[PDB]
């Protein structure tokens, strides 16, 4: 199965929002290899977080990653209009799929 994500998360400018990503003990709960990606419409995906909480360069420190048990979370602090995009998680898995992805969350920013 895919990782479970909410279809839609919204916020006002300046709000802190969190996107959940739920798997199992064979993926999100078994390893520290959770990544998060941002995709604006018609653009290439961008790696925002890897290894649960690590940011590549060029990613705002307003983005942070964590996990607890079988659920990973992406938190966006100080929400800005430019954050309106789709967000996906992935995890390494012990299974043959090797990596498993979430179904994606559309973030809408008020205004
Ligand atoms: Ca908007």
Numbering used by the authors: 4 to 114
Please quote the authors directly.
The LCs are composed of an N-terminal variable (VL) and a constant domain (CL). Even though full length LCs and other proteins have recently been found as part of fibrils, patient biopsies predominantly revealed VL domains that result from proteolytic cleavage of the LC as the main constituent of amyloid deposits. To determine potential structural differences between the two VL variants Pat-1 and WT-1, the X-ray structure of both proteins were solved to 2.5 Å (Pat-1) and to 1.55 Å (WT-1) resolutions.
The corresponding germline LC sequence, named WT-1, was identified by database-assisted (abYsis, IgBLAST) primary structure alignments searching for the germline LC with the lowest number of residue changes with respect to the Pat-1 sequence. However, incubation of the VL domain of Pat-1 revealed the presence of fibrils after a lag phase, while the WT-1 VL stayed soluble. The melting temperatures (Tm) at which 50% of the protein is unfolded were determined to be 48.9°C and 57.0°C for Pat-1 and WT-1, respectively. In WT-1, this proline is not involved in a hydrophobic interaction network. The hydrophobic interaction pattern of the WT-1 L81 misses one interaction each in FR2 and in FR3 but two more interactions to the C-terminal region appear. Overall, this leads to three hydrophobic interactions of L81 to the C-terminal region (V109, V111 and L112). We therefore cloned WT-1 L81V and analyzed its properties. The thermal stability of WT-1 L81V decreased by 5.5°C compared to WT-1 and the cM value for chemical unfolding, is reduced by 0.42 M GdmCl.
